[PDB]
Design an enzyme around this catalytic site. Structure first.
Site, PDB file in Angstrom:
ATOM      1  N   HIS A 116      -8.645  -7.180   4.489  1.00 48.96           N
ATOM      2  CA  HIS A 116      -8.159  -5.985   5.185  1.00 48.96           C
ATOM      3  C   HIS A 116      -9.325  -5.050   5.402  1.00 48.96           C
ATOM      4  CE1 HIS A 116      -5.049  -2.939   6.012  1.00 48.96           C
ATOM      5  NE2 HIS A 116      -5.714  -2.086   5.255  1.00 48.96           N
ATOM      6  N   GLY A 156      -3.722   4.696   4.198  1.00 48.31           N
ATOM      7  CA  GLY A 156      -2.433   4.786   3.482  1.00 48.31           C
ATOM      8  C   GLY A 156      -1.683   6.081   3.693  1.00 48.31           C
ATOM      9  N   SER A 190      -4.622  -0.218   9.963  1.00 43.44           N
ATOM     10  CA  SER A 190      -3.772   0.081   8.833  1.00 43.44           C
ATOM     11  C   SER A 190      -2.868   1.331   9.090  1.00 43.44           C
ATOM     12  CB  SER A 190      -4.583   0.219   7.513  1.00 43.44           C
ATOM     13  OG  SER A 190      -3.617   0.041   6.593  1.00 43.44           O
ATOM     14  N   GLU A 218      -5.381 -10.317   4.718  1.00 45.09           N
ATOM     15  CA  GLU A 218      -4.958  -8.944   4.530  1.00 45.09           C
ATOM     16  C   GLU A 218      -4.691  -8.538   3.061  1.00 45.09           C
ATOM     17  OE1 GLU A 218      -4.894  -6.584   6.590  1.00 45.09           O
ATOM     18  OE2 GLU A 218      -4.888  -7.386   8.598  1.00 45.09           O
TER      19      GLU A 218
HETATM   20  P1  LIG Z   1      -3.596   0.959   5.239  1.00 43.62           P
HETATM   21  O1  LIG Z   1      -3.778   2.374   5.600  1.00 43.62           O
HETATM   22  N1  LIG Z   1      -2.024   0.522   4.476  1.00 43.62           N
HETATM   23  C1  LIG Z   1      -2.061   0.848   3.073  1.00 43.62           C
HETATM   24  C2  LIG Z   1      -0.708   1.350   2.594  1.00 43.62           C
HETATM   25  O2  LIG Z   1      -4.693   0.328   4.377  1.00 43.62           O
HETATM   26  C3  LIG Z   1      -5.469   1.151   3.481  1.00 43.62           C
HETATM   27  C4  LIG Z   1      -4.815   1.160   2.100  1.00 43.62           C
END
Ligand SMILES: *[P@@](=O)(NCC)OCC
Ligand SMILES: *[C@@H]1O[C@H](CO[C@H]2O[C@@H](C)[C@@H](O)[C@@H](O)[C@@H]2O)[C@@H](O[C@@H]2O[C@H](CO)[C@@H](O)[C@H](O)[C@H]2NC(C)=O)[C@H](O)[C@H]1NC(C)=O
Ligand SMILES: *[C@@H]1O[C@H](CO[C@H]2O[C@@H](C)[C@@H](O)[C@@H](O)[C@@H]2O)[C@@H](O[C@@H]2O[C@H](CO)[C@@H](O)[C@H](O)[C@H]2NC(C)=O)[C@H](O)[C@H]1NC(C)=O
Ligand SMILES: *[C@@H]1O[C@H](CO[C@H]2O[C@@H](C)[C@@H](O)[C@@H](O)[C@@H]2O)[C@@H](O[C@@H]2O[C@H](CO)[C@@H](O)[C@H](O)[C@H]2NC(C)=O)[C@H](O)[C@H]1NC(C)=O
Ligand SMILES: *[C@@H]1O[C@H](CO[C@H]2O[C@@H](C)[C@@H](O)[C@@H](O)[C@@H]2O)[C@@H](O[C@@H]2O[C@H](CO)[C@@H](O)[C@H](O)[C@H]2NC(C)=O)[C@H](O)[C@H]1NC(C)=O
Ligand SMILES: *[C@@H]1O[C@H](CO[C@H]2O[C@@H](C)[C@@H](O)[C@@H](O)[C@@H]2O)[C@@H](O)[C@H](O)[C@H]1NC(C)=O
Ligand SMILES: *[C@@H]1O[C@H](CO[C@H]2O[C@@H](C)[C@@H](O)[C@@H](O)[C@@H]2O)[C@@H](O)[C@H](O)[C@H]1NC(C)=O
Ligand SMILES: *[C@@H]1O[C@H](CO)[C@@H](O)[C@H](O)[C@H]1NC(C)=O
Ligand SMILES: *[C@@H]1O[C@H](CO)[C@@H](O)[C@H](O)[C@H]1NC(C)=O
Ligand SMILES: *[C@@H]1O[C@H](CO)[C@@H](O)[C@H](O)[C@H]1NC(C)=O
Ligand SMILES: *[C@@H]1O[C@H](CO)[C@@H](O)[C@H](O)[C@H]1NC(C)=O
Ligand SMILES: *[C@@H]1O[C@H](CO)[C@@H](O)[C@H](O)[C@H]1NC(C)=O
Ligand SMILES: *[C@@H]1O[C@H](CO)[C@@H](O)[C@H](O)[C@H]1NC(C)=O
Ligand SMILES: [Cl-]
Ligand SMILES: [Cl-]
Ligand SMILES: [Cl-]
Ligand SMILES: [Cl-]
Ligand SMILES: [Cl-]
Ligand SMILES: [Cl-]
Ligand code: NA
Ligand code: NA
Lengths: 527, 176, 352
Positions: free
Chosen positions: A436, A115, A196, A323
C-alpha cells in the site's frame, strides 16, 4: 519575479529547475480563514483578502495530527510523517505550473491519504513538479483537517457538523475554480486524484452535490468510500464525540456546551485522547472520518452508489498487489519488518482477532475457512500470505472493485489497474511485496529523476504511468498512444477487464480476485 | 541467427534482430540470451501452433489452447532454460503422481489436474476439471483468442498469446 | 470571415475550409485547434493531412533549425530574445537564402519550417489528439491523386527527367531511396525495396521507375490521408474519401508522371468549365460534377450529385473503407485503397 494576481491578492512563487527546464511552484497559498478559536470544528470560512504580496515560497504548516512513532529512525514509516510544523492554522494549498506559463492547462488536484487521521500535502512523494515539467499540467494539492479536528461530528449541530475536512477539500476545489485561470489553468479540465483516504475522499466528491461542478474527472488509487474504514456511522460518531468529551472532562448536557468546552482544550489534549474514543481498534482504525451529515453527504453513500446518484464522468481506479501487508507489522502476532514473519495457524487466528474485533466467532471462522484452503499445506509462508491477502482484500481491493462495477453500470467509462511493481528502493522487507502507498512515487514521477537510484525499467514504467494519468486527465482515456503500448480497455460489468502495471509486460486480465471478493462482497457483510 | 536461419537473406535476419532486440531496456545482461530462445521457440513451435488453432477453429469446431509455464523441480537442465520443450510430457503422463519420485506436492496436484483435463477432453470433448473449483477452460476462437495457463499456483484465462511476435512470424517473415 | 462575411451576403454558420497538400494539412490542424473550432463548419482535405511525415516539425528539430539559421545569419546569441531581435534586423533575403541550409540533409519534400506543437494553436502532439478523439466533430471530405509521388522525382532522383521516360535501374532506385530517405537506417531502406520490388513480373522496364513514384506518393500523401480518415471517422462522423485518377489533357509534364500531385485543383475550381480553354468535353463534365459534389458537401454535408443518375458516394468507415474514384469515364465505388502498401507504411515503417 513571478507574481500572480488572485481574487484574494497577489502571490509570489519561485522557480525550480527540473530536468533542464523550469517549473514555477507556489507553495503555501492560503485558501480559507485559519480555523482557530471560535472556528475550531466549524466548516471553513471565506478568505478575507490582502494587499501586498503573499510569498508562497515554502510549504505551509501541516494540520494537527498524531504521528507514527512505531519505527523511529526508519525511512519506511517516517517518510509518511509530516515534514512541516503542525498547527491548526494549516488551510493552505500548493500550485505547480510549468514554465513558460501554459495557456489553458489541464489541472490535477491531489488529495492525500492517511486514514483521515494524518497526512500532509508537502510530503516529498506528492511533489508535483515532475508532472508539471514532464506533462505540462498544473498540479494543485491542499492540506485539510484530519482527526477530530477535521471530522468530529455532533449530527446536524453547526458547531460540530462533521465532514469539516471534506469541506476544506471542497473549498480548495472552489479556489481552483475561481483562481486557476490566472495561473494559466483550465477550470473546465480538472481531475481529482488521491490515494487511500484521499481516494475515498475523491469518491465522495463524486457523490457530493456541492462538489459536482468543481471538477471534471476522478482517479482513485487504493481507496473508495465503500471500504469498511471510510465512513463512520452516526451511531459511532456520537459515541465517539461523547467519549472524547468524557476523556477531556467535557461531558455536558447541552451539546453546544460540550463543543464549547472542547474548543478550549489544547490541540494536544484532543489528539492524545482520539485513540481511546473506541474500546477496541485496529491498525486500520478511522476513529474520526466522513459521516452522513445531511450536507456534504446527503444519504448513506452505499444507497447513492447503488441508485446511480453521483456525478456522471470517467473514473480511473486501481490497487496494488499487496495492499494488506503494511498493516500487519502494527499489531499482528509474530509479524516483524525485521524478519520473514513465518507465522502459524494459531497466530493467523490471533491476527484475525486483531483485524476483526467483533466480528462473531463464526464471522472469523468463515475468513479462516475461505483463506486457508492450501494447495498445498506444505509452504511455510502460507499463513503469513493469507493474512496479508485477507487484510488487503477486505479493506482495499474488493471494495475498489465493487465501487468500479457499480459506478460503471450507469454508463460511464471506467478504467481499472492492478499495480504489481515493487520499488527497487523499498525500505520494507521482501515478504511485504508491493505495498500500500508505493505506487504513489511512480505516479508523481520520482523515478524520472535519474540522480535517484531507481532502475531503468523503473524510469520507463513511471514515464508510462505519468502519461496514462495525464491522458486520462486531459482526454478521459488512459492510453499511452506512441510506444506500441498495450491498450487499456474500459472496465465493464460482465467482462471486468483490468490492466496490470509492472516493469515487464503489461497485460489485460479479467475478474481480479473473483472468488475472494464474492466472499467479502456478497457473504461477509452478512455476518 | 546465422545458425538457426541458414539462408535466409541478410535482410531476413536483420528483420529478426530488429523485431526481437527492442529492449526495455538495453541494461539487462541476459537480453540477448533470452531473445534467441524466444526467436527459436516462437518461429518453430508457438506461432505455428497458434496459427493452426485459429485456422482450425474458424470452421466451427471447439478448440482449447494452453500455455504451460511450470518448470519441473527435477529438471536436469540449468535455470536459464526455463520451461523447456518436452517437459510437460511427464506431467501429462502423470509421473508426478508417484510420490516415491521426489516431485513437489504442488506438482502432484498440477499433474493430477492436467491428467483429468486430458481425460475429460478425450472422453467428453471438454478439458474441464469439474470438481475442485477449477478455472474453467474457455474455447479458443478467432477474435478473442483465449487460452489457459498451466502452472502450480493460479491458472489464468488470458488472450492473444505472443500477439506481436506472431504477427511478425506469421504475416511478414514468410515473405522474406 | 466570421465577423464580416454577412455583409457580403455570406453565412458565417456555413463555412467549409478546403486546401491542398500543406493547405490540407493546415485544414486538418484547424480541426484539432481549439481556437479554430467555432470559425468553420466542415472541412475538405485534398492530398494532405497533418499526420503526413512532412507536416509537423518536432520541437527538437525546430530549435536546431532556429539556432542553425541564427548561426548562418551571424545571429547566434546567448539570450534567445536577442537571437530573435538580431533576426528581425536581417533582410528578408538573408533569411530566405539560408532557410535551405538549417538542415544537414533535405529532400525534394523538405519542410524546414512548419507547424509545431506550440502549446497555443496546437496543444499536444497531434497524433495523440487524433487517436484520442480530441478534435472538432463534423463531416470531412478527403482525397488523393493516383500518382501523388511522381512530381518530386525530377527534383533529385537519379536518372529521372521530365524530358524523357526515366526508365531507371535497380541501382538508381536504391539511390533514389537514399535521396528520399536521408536516414533512415540501411534496414529501413532495404525494407522499402523489399516491399516495393516484388514484380509480376521482373520483365517490364518501367518497374523501378513506377515503384519509386509509388513509394514517395504512398509514404508522403496517400497512406497518411487514409489513416487520418479512418481515425477521424472512428469517432462517429461521416467522412467521404476520393481517389482522383484523371490526367489533365493539358498537363505540361510528361506521360510517365501520370495523374500528378496538385492537378486535381483546376478541376475543383472549375477551370474546365471555361470552353475557351482547350480542355476536352469529358473534362468539362468531370469538373462540373466535382464542383457540384464539393458545393453539396459544403452546403449540406454530403458530396452527392443528385440529378444526373450519378454514382452515389458512400461514407467511409473503418471496416469497409469505401471510396469513390473520380475519372472521366465511370466513377466506381471501391474498397481499401492501397491496403497492403499502407499496412507497410502505417504499421511497420514508423518502427524502423
Ligand atoms: P489509507 O488512508 N486507509 C487507511 C484506513 O491508508 C493509510 C493508512
Ligand atoms: C460506546 O462507548 C462506550 C464508552 O466506553 C468507553 O469509555 C470511553 C471514555 C473510552 O475510554 C473507551 O475505551 C471505553 O470503552 C463503550 O462502552 C464500553 O464497552 C466496552 C466493551 O463493550 C466495555 O468493556 C466497557 O465496560 C464499556 N464502558 C462503559 C462506560 O459502558 C461502548 O462499547 C461504545 N460502543 C461500541 C459498541 O463501540
Ligand atoms: C520475527 O520477529 C517477531 C517480532 O518480535 C520480535 O522481533 C524480533 C526481530 C526480535 O527482536 C524479538 O525480540 C522481537 O520481540 C517475533 O515475534 C516474537 O516471537 C517471539 C518468540 O520467541 C515472542 O517471544 C514474541 O512474543 C513475538 N513478538 C511479538 C510480541 O509479536 C517472531 O517470532 C520472529 N519470527 C521469526 C524469526 O521467524
Ligand atoms: C542539428 O544541427 C546541427 C548543425 O549543423 C549544421 O550547421 C548549420 C549552420 C548548417 O549549415 C548545417 O548544414 C550543418 O550541418 C547538425 O550537425 C551537423 O550534422 C552533420 C551530420 O550529422 C555533421 O556532418 C556535421 O558535422 C554537424 N555539424 C555540427 C556543427 O555539429 C545536426 O545534424 C542537426 N540535427 C539533425 C540530426 O539534423
Ligand atoms: C533521361 O534524362 C536523364 C536526366 O539527365 C539528363 O537529361 C537528358 C534529357 C540530357 O539532357 C542529359 O544531358 C541530362 O543530364 C538522364 O540521366 C542522366 O543519365 C546520364 C547517362 O548518360 C548521366 O550522365 C547523368 O548523370 C544522368 N543525369 C542525372 C544527373 O540525373 C537519363 O539517363 C535519361 N534517360 C533515358 C534517356 O532513358
Ligand atoms: C480553455 O478551454 C475551454 C474549454 O476546453 C475544455 O472543454 C471542457 C468542456 C472540457 O472538456 C475540457 O477538457 C476542455 O479542454 C474554453 O472554453 C476556454 O475558453 C479556454 N480558455 C482559454 C484558452 O483561455
Ligand atoms: C442564414 O442561415 C442561418 C442558419 O443556417 C445554417 O444553420 C447552421 C447551423 C448550418 O447548418 C448552416 O449550414 C445552415 O445553412 C440563420 O440562422 C441566419 O439567420 C441566416 N441569415 C440570414 C438569412 O440573414
Ligand atoms: C516576500 O518576499 C520578498 C523576497 O524578495 C520580500 O521582499 C518581502 O519582504 C517578503 N514579504 C514578507 C517576508 O512578508
Ligand atoms: C444550549 O446552550 C446554547 C449555547 O449558549 C444555547 O444557545 C441554547 O439555548 C441551549 N439549548 C437548550 C435550550 O437546551
Ligand atoms: C516512448 O519511448 C521512448 C523510447 O523509444 C522513450 O524515450 C519515451 O519514454 C516514451 N514516451 C512515453 C510517453 O513513454
Ligand atoms: C480434487 O481435490 C482434492 C483435494 O480436495 C484432491 O485430492 C484431488 O487430487 C482433486 N481431484 C482432481 C481431479 O484434481
Ligand atoms: C534577455 O534579454 C531580454 C530582452 O531585453 C530581457 O528582457 C531579459 O531580461 C533577458 N533574459 C535574461 C534574464 O537572461
Ligand atoms: C446534368 O447533366 C446535364 C446533361 O444532361 C449537364 O448539362 C449538367 O452539366 C449536369 N449537371 C451537373 C451538376 O453535373
Ligand atoms: Cl504445497
Ligand atoms: Cl486474483
Ligand atoms: Cl533495463
Ligand atoms: Cl506474450
Ligand atoms: Cl512481366
Ligand atoms: Cl490499390
Ligand atoms: Na459461510
Ligand atoms: Na520488415
Amino acid at each position: 519575479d513571478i507574481i500572480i494576481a488572485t481574487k484574494n491578492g497577489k502571490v509570489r512563487g519561485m522557480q525550480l529547475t527540473v530536468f533542464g527546464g523550469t517549473v514555477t511552484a507556489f507553495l503555501g497559498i492560503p485558501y480559507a480563514q485559519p480555523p482557530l478559536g471560535r472556528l475550531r470544528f466549524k466548516k471553513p470560512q471565506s478568505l478575507t483578502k490582502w494587499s501586498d504580496i503573499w510569498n508562497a515560497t515554502k510549504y505551509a504548516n501541516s494540520c494537527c495530527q498524531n504521528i507514527d512513532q512505531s519505527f523511529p529512525g526508519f525511512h519506511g514509516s517516517e517518510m509518511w510523517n509530516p515534514n512541516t510544523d503542525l498547527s491548526e492554522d494549516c488551510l493552505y494549498l500548493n500550485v505547480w505550473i510549468p514554465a513558460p506559463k501554459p495557456k489553458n492547462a489541464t489541472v490535477l488536484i491531489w488529495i492525500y491519504g492517511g486514514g483521515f487521521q494524518t497526512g500532509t500535502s508537502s510530503l516529498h512523494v506528492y511533489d508535483g513538479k515532475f508532472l508539471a515539467r514532464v506533462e505540462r499540467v498544473i498540479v494543485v494539492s491542499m492540506n485539510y483537517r484530519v482527526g477530530a479536528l477535521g471530522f468530529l461530528a455532533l449530527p446536524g449541530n453547526p458547531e460540530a457538523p462533521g465532514n469539516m475536512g471534506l469541506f476544506d477539500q471542497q473549498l480548495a476545489l472552489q479556489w481552483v475554480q475561481k483562481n486557476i485561470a490566472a495561473f494559466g489553468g483550465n477550470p473546465k479540465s480538472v481531475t481529482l486524484f488521491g490515494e487511500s483516504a484521499g481516494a475515498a475522499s475523491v469518491s465522495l466528491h463524486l457523490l457530493s452535490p456541492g462538489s459536482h461542478s468543481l471538477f471534471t474527472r476522478a482517479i482513485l488509487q487504493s481507496g473508495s468510500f465503500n471500504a469498511p474504514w471510510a465512513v463512520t456511522s452516526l451511531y459511532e460518531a456520537r459515541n465517539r464525540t461523547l467519549n472524547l468529551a468524557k476523556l477531556t472532562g467535557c461531558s455536558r448536557e447541552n451539546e453546544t456546551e460540550i463543543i464549547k468546552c472542547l474548543r478550549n482544550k489544547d490541540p494536544q489534549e484532543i489528539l492524545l485522547n482520539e485513540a481511546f474514543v473506541v474500546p477496541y481498534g485496529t491498525p486500520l482504525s478511522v476513529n474520526f472520518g466522513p459521516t452522513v451529515d445531511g450536507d456534504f453527504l446527503t444519504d448513506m453513500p452505499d444507497i447513492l452508489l447503488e441508485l446511480g446518484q453521483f456525478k456522471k464522468t470517467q473514473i480511473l481506479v486501481g490497487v496494488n498487489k499487496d495492499e494488506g501487508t503494511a498493516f500487519l507489522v502494527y499489531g499482528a502476532p509474530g509479524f516483524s519488518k525485521d524478519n520473514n514473519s513465518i507465522i502459524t495457524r494459531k497466530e493467523f487466528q490471533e491476527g484475525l482477532k486483531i483485524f476483526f474485533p467483533g466480528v462473531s466467532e463464526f464471522g472469523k471462522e468463515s475468513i479462516l475457512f475461505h483463506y486457508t484452503d492450501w494447495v498445498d499445506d506444505q509452504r511455510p509462508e502460507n499463513y503469513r500470505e493469507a493474512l496479508g491477502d485477507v487484510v488487503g482484500d477486505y479493506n482495499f481491493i474488493c471494495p475498489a472493485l465493487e465501487f468500479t462495477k457499480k459506478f460503471s453500470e450507469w454508463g460511464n467509462n471506467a478504467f481499472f489497474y492492478y499495480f504489481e511493481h515493487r520499488s527497487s528502493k523499498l525500505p520494507w522487507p521482501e515478504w511485504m511485496g508491493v505495498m500500500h502507498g508505493y505506487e504513489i512515487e511512480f505516479v508523481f514521477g520520482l523515478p524520472l529523476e535519474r540522480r535517484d537510484q531507481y532502475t531503468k525499467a523503473e524510469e520507463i514504467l513511471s514515464r508510462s504511468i505519468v502519461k496514462r494519468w495525464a491522458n486520462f486527465a486531459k482526454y478521459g482515456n488512459p492510453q499511452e498512444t506512441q510506444n506500441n503500448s498495450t491498450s487499456w480497455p474500459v472496465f465493464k460489468s460482465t467482462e471486468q477487464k483490468y490492466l496490470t502495471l509492472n516493469t515487464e509486460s503489461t497485460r489485460i486480465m479479467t475478474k481480479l480476485r473473483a472468488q475472494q471478493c464474492r466472499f467479502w462482497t456478497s457473504f461477509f457483510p452478512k455476518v
